[PDB]
Amino acid sequence: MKKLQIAVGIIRNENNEIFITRRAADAHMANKLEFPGGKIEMGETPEQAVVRELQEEVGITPQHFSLFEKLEYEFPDRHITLWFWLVERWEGEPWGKEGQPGEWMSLVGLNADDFPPANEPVIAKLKRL
Ligand SMILES: Nc1nc2c([nH]c(=O)n2[C@H]2C[C@H](O)[C@@H](COP(=O)(O)O)O2)c(=O)[nH]1
């Protein structure tokens, strides 16, 4: 079967703003407004998957932990698990290896349009704030 897991955590900055990968720092993918922690799927545990990938997607030392929301849905012949974790702080700039560098933005205005549309089920909840 076709199934893939994803665990992410919105890093909280020093100004109630979270650092998320958006249009990279100088890339073309402007609709890549996503978060770190992806790839947890690999072969980790529901708990170590994020905690492990966290170091891989942050590399820094941030007071980051707890989950904000987690959901598991499967598309017509596809299985996508998206876990959203809550973060409270992060020292310096987050690097790890998420993919496309981001900037400290206000999560109160998340972009469900810029980020993957099929991945709205998660944002549809928080987006409505
Ligand atoms: N089944 C399913 N998987 C999806 C959808 N959208 C989406 O990004 N995914 C997948 C692809 C990605 O690899 C992953 C999210 O993190 P990455 O883009 O970093 O891999 O989940 C979808 O609509 N259905």
Ligand SMILES: [Mg+2]
């Ligand atoms: Mg990763």
